[PDB]
Design an enzyme around this catalytic site. Structure first.
Site, mmCIF file in Angstrom:
data_model
loop_
_atom_site.group_PDB
_atom_site.id
_atom_site.type_symbol
_atom_site.label_atom_id
_atom_site.label_comp_id
_atom_site.label_asym_id
_atom_site.label_seq_id
_atom_site.Cartn_x
_atom_site.Cartn_y
_atom_site.Cartn_z
ATOM 1 N N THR D 126 0.777 -1.215 0.000
ATOM 2 C CA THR D 126 0.000 0.000 0.000
ATOM 3 C C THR D 126 0.820 1.283 0.000
ATOM 4 O O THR D 126 1.754 1.478 0.775
ATOM 5 C CB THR D 126 -0.999 0.075 1.236
ATOM 6 O OG1 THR D 126 -1.737 -1.164 1.246
ATOM 7 C CG2 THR D 126 -1.928 1.298 1.193
ATOM 8 N N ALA D 130 -2.341 4.365 -3.803
ATOM 9 C CA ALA D 130 -2.946 3.069 -4.181
ATOM 10 C C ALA D 130 -2.855 2.046 -3.059
ATOM 11 O O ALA D 130 -1.781 1.789 -2.501
ATOM 12 C CB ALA D 130 -2.294 2.571 -5.464
ATOM 13 N N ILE D 157 1.471 0.943 7.094
ATOM 14 C CA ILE D 157 2.155 -0.344 7.282
ATOM 15 C C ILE D 157 2.161 -0.781 8.741
ATOM 16 O O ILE D 157 2.724 -0.102 9.611
ATOM 17 C CB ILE D 157 3.603 -0.304 6.670
ATOM 18 C CG1 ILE D 157 3.562 0.217 5.219
ATOM 19 C CG2 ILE D 157 4.310 -1.684 6.778
ATOM 20 C CD1 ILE D 157 2.747 -0.664 4.220
ATOM 21 N N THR D 273 -34.882 -4.118 33.494
ATOM 22 C CA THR D 273 -35.715 -3.022 33.023
ATOM 23 C C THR D 273 -37.163 -3.517 32.951
ATOM 24 O O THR D 273 -37.433 -4.619 32.447
ATOM 25 C CB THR D 273 -35.264 -2.427 31.632
ATOM 26 O OG1 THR D 273 -35.590 -3.453 30.640
ATOM 27 C CG2 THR D 273 -33.796 -2.019 31.542
ATOM 28 N N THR D 316 -9.291 -18.854 -3.400
ATOM 29 C CA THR D 316 -9.660 -17.449 -3.621
ATOM 30 C C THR D 316 -11.121 -17.169 -3.333
ATOM 31 O O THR D 316 -11.446 -16.234 -2.556
ATOM 32 C CB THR D 316 -9.222 -16.965 -5.056
ATOM 33 O OG1 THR D 316 -7.801 -17.331 -5.138
ATOM 34 C CG2 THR D 316 -9.450 -15.483 -5.335
ATOM 35 N N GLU D 366 -6.704 -5.608 3.969
ATOM 36 C CA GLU D 366 -6.600 -6.968 3.425
ATOM 37 C C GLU D 366 -7.692 -7.201 2.389
ATOM 38 O O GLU D 366 -8.224 -8.310 2.234
ATOM 39 C CB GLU D 366 -6.725 -8.037 4.501
ATOM 40 C CG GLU D 366 -5.474 -8.354 5.329
ATOM 41 C CD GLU D 366 -4.773 -9.602 4.858
ATOM 42 O OE1 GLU D 366 -4.687 -9.895 3.674
ATOM 43 O OE2 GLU D 366 -4.333 -10.284 5.796
#
Ligand SMILES: CCCCCCCC(=O)SCCNC(=O)CCNC(=O)[C@H](O)C(C)(C)COP(=O)(O)OP(=O)(O)OC[C@H]1O[C@@H](n2cnc3c(N)ncnc32)[C@H](O)[C@@H]1OP(=O)(O)O
Ligand SMILES: CCCCCCCC(=O)SCCNC(=O)CCNC(=O)[C@H](O)C(C)(C)COP(=O)(O)OP(=O)(O)OC[C@H]1O[C@@H](n2cnc3c(N)ncnc32)[C@H](O)[C@@H]1OP(=O)(O)O
Ligand SMILES: CCCCCCCC(=O)SCCNC(=O)CCNC(=O)[C@H](O)C(C)(C)COP(=O)(O)OP(=O)(O)OC[C@H]1O[C@@H](n2cnc3c(N)ncnc32)[C@H](O)[C@@H]1OP(=O)(O)O
Ligand SMILES: CCCCCCCC(=O)SCCNC(=O)CCNC(=O)[C@H](O)C(C)(C)COP(=O)(O)OP(=O)(O)OC[C@H]1O[C@@H](n2cnc3c(N)ncnc32)[C@H](O)[C@@H]1OP(=O)(O)O
Ligand SMILES: Cc1cc2nc3c(=O)[nH]c(=O)nc-3n(C[C@H](O)[C@H](O)[C@H](O)COP(=O)(O)OP(=O)(O)OC[C@H]3O[C@@H](n4cnc5c(N)ncnc54)[C@H](O)[C@@H]3O)c2cc1C
Ligand SMILES: Cc1cc2nc3c(=O)[nH]c(=O)nc-3n(C[C@H](O)[C@H](O)[C@H](O)COP(=O)(O)OP(=O)(O)OC[C@H]3O[C@@H](n4cnc5c(N)ncnc54)[C@H](O)[C@@H]3O)c2cc1C
Ligand SMILES: Cc1cc2nc3c(=O)[nH]c(=O)nc-3n(C[C@H](O)[C@H](O)[C@H](O)COP(=O)(O)OP(=O)(O)OC[C@H]3O[C@@H](n4cnc5c(N)ncnc54)[C@H](O)[C@@H]3O)c2cc1C
Ligand SMILES: Cc1cc2nc3c(=O)[nH]c(=O)nc-3n(C[C@H](O)[C@H](O)[C@H](O)COP(=O)(O)OP(=O)(O)OC[C@H]3O[C@@H](n4cnc5c(N)ncnc54)[C@H](O)[C@@H]3O)c2cc1C
Lengths: 385, 385, 385, 385
Positions: D126, D130, D157, D273, D316, D366
């Site tokens: 990063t 970007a 970072i 309550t 993925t 992430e």
């Protein structure tokens, strides 16, 4: 006939509130959030601008504005900071009870003084053991000759340690079986009275520059001429107060939603990813769209509810809708606003994380999100029963 | 200032519409959904009552009512059946184009007839290949001397098989690189014109009594005097139409939400489980509350959008907000209503599963939920840009 | 150690179920929805394929499969049609009580016969006055010598008029103050018994080919040897049944969600708007993404819950999560699937509107959405109490 | 078949992590959030306990644990403080690249040191310009004989000011038209290298004890032997890393959700309550149920994703589902937890407002909630296309 058109007078109040909010509040709101001071300079100015105590009748040197007016002004202030704005709003909260349940003498004396100096006041109902359940309040008031003796503790009082006087709800009937409608009494209690122990400044997640403290009342002596309508009429005044006072709290939340919206939009029109402006990604433009939709709806619900009471009608139903809905979307927008900012949004040098922290309270005080669904449901069923 | 107050005139239309809807629509609505018959007897009645063609100016024997009026009426009709109401609204849809872009002769002739006999009309934009993308339409209009030759197909047309005349959007500029603002022409086309081939009645999930069909146009001859404003002005008349016409579709959706809410509430006050009335389970009271919240919110949004356009200003932003929000909550309420009916809610003898089937279209026709977000975003962003 | 890997045997059951679902069910599911016949031919085949009564122990000629197996198979069938699949599933529902609360003799006689012919069975608990509140059941059973006398009415019985025998829950203790745990008795009642009056086929919104009827029991005589564990053990068997039977109902809903997902995706990969494929609009790809996410989660929750019971442990908590969650997303996907189809989605010639109609029931039978939150909450609190 | 059963080995790490988290983290977590100190003493302990660098192979003195193991541990740590846990995970993040794309010499040297001393590392991708778009990075790596000259800036970072070495993604192909798969090079860079200019500690809303800084790299010299696999293999190592590393971030999010749930539950079983325990109001019991539902669902998703990659297959699709879903529900639970605490929930003396501030990052780092949908869509669609 329908009209969503402001009066020229309203247009002027709005312009004043907007200019001060954006020229005076914004540039320092961040520093006040960090330090958590009381924004004295701001309140002072707000007073001089006539942006405080707006609801005090003309007879007592007030501007005598309506609920529609307050909402309009308070939407503008909230835009700057809800920390500051809450300070201001609390004043109106402590005043309403007086306006709607006080005699000429009480009004003249306590509302009158707010007009002369930049004094503050507070509303004392909540206790450590009871907030949502007002009928569960344990602060007791005992009549002794020509005065009352107050013993009990209140918690989470905005303007707690900066108030000249307090409106105070206590149980005046010891009978556990006594009904809510006649078991409580509303009082005006001067903060300088021996026996009032102001607690420490409570440190919360948001609205940090706002003064929130607990208060203990130990054998506090209050003159019977500080009782508001009479002994037993305490509950009704409290209830009557939320109806005039919910709309403006709804307006604060859609001020803080508008800010979030403005920040998110501006940023999306500057930041680029994958060669395009954030706004040009359909997924972002859709989020901005949804965001815009919510703010308008919520602004629309508080106007409905404010108009209702200004017309001299009971607005319990509309007021709850407004507070319930406005509170939720301000929360939704706040989080969606930091999302748009990405990594920067999580960062304290950017203006949205504060918003996300400030927004949460809207779902809690002045009647929790859940309590609102109880009111709405009860008011709703009432029309089929 | 603000006003959420109906005129005495608006109160009367309202009563008329309500009485019609509850005394005449409701009792037969169920049996029209099953058979899918065109509700001829109901439409005739609505015409006589003056609850149809409400936007036609007085000059042509109309009421010359505004968008606020249309909405007010529609909400009452929709409460009964949006199947029946959709038939009615389709009329206003085909008329508007004529009202905003037609000359006196055109209006006198085509609007004038609607005021004489209980005739219907339709709006023909959508094609098999393009609905959302009206710049994607392919039905051609070729100039041949003093007339235009029209070739193409329209799909999903409300009143398609029951209309006297049609508003027809066609591509007149053959150049593919021609801009939307100049590539389309609006026509008014008589249903009895040789070449118009009306398709079969389409069987849908909801609004089953509504007539919606596909239409083929081969070598259809239309006199140049049937061109609405001019060659190329098509696109703008269409968009101009949606602004006036989005609000009333929104109102139809909050009528079908009001109905859902009424049914669910009534049921919650009768059915018992675990010794308590459904309304007594906090789970359900909260659900009911959220339902009421959304109905009130959606009603407010169409009101705002209607007032805007009646005031003489472009309401694209508000219209799309109302269409989008009403559409969503109609769908949420329909399913929640089925839910508090339990097992009976899934059954055809109870009134809520129809509501569920009916509601889905609101998220599709007159600009798709997604298309509404596109518009809001565009409109929103333009205030910063 | 973790494993999300199917056994080769499971891979084979799955392939069989999938092939039949897609080659036999799909091509006719639409016609059966329209007509509402009982899909006899399909059930017959399903029986021959060994895709029915999968849970009958090997000792009685059954396949003796587990709950994991049933889920796997029933996810595949549901994909084709939940109307058909529900017919099949009901068989297992009526059988479980027997499997878990029956003796060798009862099991042999009633489970045995399901193995020989393609017979059906049903589960009879719900009554007009009680569904969610099973302890509110009023069907009474009176012991007379060596038999019981059943009087009462049951409503919404799947396989109601096609069942060979029924499992039947009745109140055997007239004492109103008798606890749930000992006030009811489970029976096997043969449908041919004098006194059972099968009602009409109920017409619902979805799962139309499924047989749902009410049933009246007028002085039905049942041999004491048809009592399952004993008099009083009725409640526990019912409760024990939902734990083995909820996972498979969750699996049906994520079958119907997968279908919706498949249809929506295929269509989005074909249809173009504004020059791009639907899938290429970020707003659509995001919807497809969200849709995909839900199906996987819900498939994951039913596997957890099925594994739990197969391991011989109480799964009440996981089973409710699964049924609650699977039911909601199938509903969400169904509506999102017709959305993707646009105008076509609302149309009966397309396969998604059916899905939207079928899905609704998942939130109602076998324990309503609300009832699941009651179970989950109770099971959840139990770990801190 | 399926198994949701931990190995006896996994049960022991789990116990170790839990005990550490509740006995050592929890008691001081609050005071690290306020001061924003680097939790040195906690990290040392975690190292000694073997709850850090868990993925380093045995060859280099590691445990050589799998992703399932990392997740299991992380969930326990995160329960305590995700501020502290994030410090720990950042280590695994910088290590993975080295594990999947480094040679023996590289691993021995850089991984080996991590096993000797309680050293930290960081992942540097990063930049100010970007984050989401890692193809947009501009820090250049220019080949100069036997070394590379690195110029650029990294932002946000984790462990940035506390790492011994960094994994650094840089652009090595100057050609703008060069594809992502060949334009980037991965390096391992020692923090003490002349030219690395570590910025100030950044003050964020949450995970305040975590170290996150900006880093400038001017004319930083890196030997060619520090290039991970080869020039151009950068992009693939990075994506390869997220797959292994998304699951554990998900697990961190369902630890911070478990905590929120535990706190809220405990509180709901104490506060009263309207005469009842919070848990006794159906409104709240339903809220609690939805909370438990989501925690269980999110846990299941990371388990699936972890098992997949451990099995040797690309995960993925499952990884992004888990990251996206866990992230959302962590945020929902944090706010709902604050909600059942009422007024105290907004206060700094109670443990839930920290949870709310902490949770927001999960929707950003992430791979952003939006970026997760992009991936799911892409992965989903590829199975039809
Ligand atoms: C931005 C501003 C800055 C300051 C921010 C901080 C401000 C604050 O947070 S103050 C917050 C104080 N806490 C609250 O808001 C909690 C409020 N909760 C409530 O409103 C109530 O407890 C509520 C509505 C649930 C009622 O509970 P309940 O115990 O059942 O009383 P209930 O039985 O309904 O009514 C008792 C009597 O009051 C009456 N009553 C109830 N509601 C109302 C109403 N809205 N108006 C008038 N009368 C009412 C009833 O008619 C009844 O009368 P009777 O005996 O003659 O029949
Ligand atoms: C209840 C009633 C019963 C009957 C129910 C059934 C009725 C129906 O279903 S009909 C369904 C309606 N279908 C739709 O609404 C589809 C939505 N489509 C659209 O609105 C548009 O195509 C939309 C917004 C997506 C824009 O796409 P696009 O093709 O790119 O047009 P765009 O390029 O933005 O604009 C072209 C020109 O139009 C103009 N324009 C756009 N919106 C407007 C507007 N609101 N007013 C005026 N001009 C406009 C632009 O200014 C531009 O002009 P210029 O060249 O002068 O700068
Ligand atoms: C796709 C398939 C095709 C067929 C589709 C159609 C199928 C159907 O729709 S059948 C649907 C039938 N209707 C239902 O599902 C409604 C079910 N509702 C319920 O589950 C319950 O009423 C429920 C859980 C709320 C309990 O209510 P409640 O009255 O309070 O009983 P409760 O007090 O909790 O418990 C009574 C006794 O049962 C026991 N019990 C309760 N839950 C369970 C359980 N899950 N397991 C075991 N025992 C239990 C208790 O321990 C208690 O015992 P004891 O007296 O020894 O202390
Ligand atoms: C708790 C821990 C503590 C520390 C917390 C803090 C850590 C952090 O915040 S680091 C933040 C991480 N940032 C991100 O994840 C940003 C997300 N960005 C991305 O994932 C990608 O850029 C993404 C998915 C948007 C794709 O954009 P794009 O630039 O166009 O790449 P794309 O063109 O799709 O693919 C390029 C090549 O990469 C390949 N690729 C893409 N994904 C993968 C994959 N998963 N595996 C292998 N190859 C892949 C493609 O196959 C393609 O190759 P080829 O030329 O051979 O066909
Ligand atoms: C910053 C701040 C400023 C404040 N300012 C003031 C002030 O100026 N004056 C004043 O009097 N008070 C003030 N309050 C207190 C505020 O009014 C209460 O915190 C709020 O009413 C909630 O009550 P509680 O904190 O007792 O939460 P509780 O009432 O204990 O409720 C806890 C949770 O249970 C839920 N719950 C409670 N009862 C029910 C029920 N019957 N059904 C369903 N759910 C239920 C609530 O929604 C909540 O989520 C302030 C509070 C804060 C934090
Ligand atoms: C009962 C009924 C009555 C109707 N009445 C009429 C009528 O009287 N006259 C008439 O002209 N038409 C009428 N319509 C048609 C209706 O207006 C369209 O169906 C609606 O506009 C949707 O367009 P479509 O069907 O082409 O879906 P498509 O435009 O093909 O879109 C499919 C899906 O993709 C989405 N989508 C499309 N473009 C985008 C984009 N750029 N970004 C993101 N998402 C996108 C849409 O949200 C939708 O979910 C009717 C339809 C029905 C079903
Ligand atoms: C198509 C179909 C097939 C069916 N098949 C069978 C079958 O084979 N065998 C069988 O025995 N039954 C069957 N059922 C019945 C089904 O089990 C019930 O309809 C379901 O349990 C709901 O009960 P109900 O209809 O009585 O709704 P009710 O219990 O009356 O509930 C009405 C509404 O109130 C809510 N509610 C009720 N009690 C509470 C509470 N305490 N707290 C909060 N909310 C509450 C419910 O959620 C629901 O939204 C079937 C039903 C249908 C529609
Ligand atoms: C506390 C913290 C720790 C971090 N730790 C690390 C670390 O150790 N190492 C490291 O390398 N980085 C780290 N990061 C950075 C983090 O990975 C990024 O901030 C995150 O990827 C978001 O990118 P961004 O900030 O550039 O937002 P942007 O990429 O600028 O995006 C802004 C917004 O637009 C949206 N958006 C962007 N592109 C698209 C698109 N194509 N379509 C739709 N929406 C889009 C995003 O959702 C976001 O809401 C950290 C950040 C923080 C705050």
């Amino acid at each position: 006939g329908f009209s969503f058109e402001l009066t020229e007078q309203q247009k002027e109040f709005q312009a004043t509130a907007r200019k001060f909010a954006r020229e005076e509040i914004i540039p320092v709101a961040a520093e006040y959030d960090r330090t958590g001071e009381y924004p004295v300079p701001l309140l002072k100015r707000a007073w001089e601008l006539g942006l405080m105590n707006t609801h005090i009748p003309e007879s007592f040197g007030g501007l005598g504005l309506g609920i529609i007016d307050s909402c309009l002004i308070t939407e503008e202030l909230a835009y700057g900071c809800t920390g500051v704005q809450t300070a201001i709003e609390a004043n109106t909260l402590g005043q309403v009870p007086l306006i709607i349940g006080g005699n000429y003498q009480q009004q003249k004396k306590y509302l009158g003084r707010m007009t002369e100096e930049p004094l503050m006041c507070a509303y004392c109902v909540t206790e450590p053991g009871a907030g949502s359940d007002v009928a569960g309040i344990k602060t007791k008031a005992e009549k002794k000759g020509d005065e009352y003796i107050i013993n009990g503790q209140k918690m989470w009082i905005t303007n707690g340690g900066k108030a000249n006087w307090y409106f105070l709800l206590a149980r005046s009937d010891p009978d556990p079986k006594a009904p809510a409608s006649k078991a409580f009494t509303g009082f005006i209690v001067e903060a300088d009275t021996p026996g009032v122990q102001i607690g420490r400044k409570e440190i919360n997640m948001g609205q940090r520059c706002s003064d929130t403290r607990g208060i203990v009342f130990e054998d506090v002596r209050v003159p019977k001429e500080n009782v508001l309508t009479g002994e037993g009429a305490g509950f009704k005044i409290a209830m009557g107060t939320f109806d005039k006072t919910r709309p403006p709290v709804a307006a604060g939340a859609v001020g803080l939603a508008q800010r979030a919206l403005d920040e998110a939009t501006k940023y999306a029109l500057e930041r680029k990813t994958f060669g395009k402006l954030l706004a040009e990604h359909q997924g972002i433009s859709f989020l901005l769209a949804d965001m815009a939709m919510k703010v308008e709806l919520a602004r629309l619900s508080y106007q409905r509810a404010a108009w209702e009471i200004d017309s001299g009608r009971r607005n319990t139903y509309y007021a709850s809708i407004a507070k319930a809905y406005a509170a939720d979307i301000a929360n939704q927008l706040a989080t969606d606003a930091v999302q748009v900012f990405g990594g920067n949004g999580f960062n304290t040098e950017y203006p949205v994380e504060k918003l996300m922290r400030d927004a949460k309270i809207y779902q809690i005080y002045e009647g929790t999100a859940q309590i609102q669904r109880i009111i709405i449901a009860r008011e709703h069923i009432g029309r089929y029963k």
